Amino acid sequence: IRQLHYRLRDEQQKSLVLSDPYELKALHLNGQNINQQVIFSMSFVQGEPSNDKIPVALGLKGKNLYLSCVMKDGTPTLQLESVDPKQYPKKKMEKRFVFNKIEVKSKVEFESAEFPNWYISTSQAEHKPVFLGNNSGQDIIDFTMESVS
């Protein structure tokens, strides 16, 4: 299926990067460093409520890794999950892979379809991993989407 490539930067202008083999971190990168950041691949998912948000799946470009949400250790958790390079991406992704892209201004927010009210969020500090938060204080849930290719 068609997959649009983008790069995300939280509202504080922090670019996202892949560090631990299966972990995303957000930090401040200048124009000389905005090339080492992750390019996501967004595709539409047919198991949709629509509502007013667009359901999408977010994988990393070129890799068989997708962001998914799971109930782990008594708390919803964002995780980078590997999948069969043959079956993915599929038109009707499993619910844990689904995010509802919501647009407010020029900012986008990604709510977990599985865990409503939980968003892909970043902390105020640098080098902290991107997580599934619920929007509280030092939690940045608004992102900018730069179209890559």
Curated annotation (Swiss-Prot):
Q: Which UniProt keywords apply?
A: Cytokine, Cytoplasm, Inflammatory response, Lysosome, Mitogen, Pyrogen, Secreted
Induction trigger = By LPS.
- Positions bearing the site annotation: Important for interaction with integrin: 53, 61, 63, 72, 86
- Provide the Gene Ontology terms for cellular component: cytosol; extracellular space; lysosome; secretory granule; vesicle
On tissue specificity, the annotation reads: Expressed in activated macrophages (at protein level).
The protein's GO terms of the molecular function aspect are: cytokine activity; integrin binding; interleukin-1 receptor binding; protein domain specific binding; receptor ligand activity
**Which subcellular locations apply to this protein?**
Cytoplasm, Cytosol; Secreted; Lysosome; Secreted, Extracellular exosome
Question: Biological process GO annotation list?
Answer: astrocyte activation; cellular response to interleukin-17; cellular response to mechanical stimulus; cellular response to xenobiotic stimulus; defense response to Gram-positive bacterium; ectopic germ cell programmed cell death; extrinsic apoptotic signaling pathway in absence of ligand; fever generation
According to its UniProt entry, what is the function of this protein? Potent pro-inflammatory cytokine. Initially discovered as the major endogenous pyrogen, induces prostaglandin synthesis, neutrophil influx and activation, T-cell activation and cytokine production, B-cell activation and antibody production, and fibroblast proliferation and collagen production. Promotes Th17 differentiation of T-cells. Synergizes with IL12/interleukin-12 to induce IFNG synthesis from T-helper 1 (Th1) cells. Plays a role in angiogenesis by inducing VEGF production synergistically with TNF and IL6.
> What's the further remark here?
IL1B production occurs in 2 steps, each being controlled by different stimuli. First, inflammatory signals, such as LPS, stimulate the synthesis and promote the accumulation of cytosolic stores of pro-IL1B (priming). Then additional signals are required for inflammasome assembly, leading to CASP1 activation, pro-IL1B processing and eventually secretion of the active cytokine. IL1B processing and secretion are temporarily associated.
- Subunit notes for this chain? Monomer. Interacts with MEFV. Interacts with integrins ITGAV:ITGBV and ITGA5:ITGB1; integrin-binding is required for IL1B signaling. Interacts with cargo receptor TMED10; the interaction is direct and is required for the secretion of IL1B mature form. Interacts with HSP90AB1; the interaction facilitates cargo translocation into the ERGIC. Interacts with HSP90B1; the interaction facilitates cargo translocation into the ERGIC.
Protein family: Belongs to the IL-1 family.
Q: What is this protein called?
A: Interleukin-1 beta
Q: Source species, please?
A: Mus musculus (Mouse)
Q: Which gene is annotated as encoding this protein in its UniProt record?
A: Il1b
What stretch of the parent protein is included here?
120 to 268 of 269
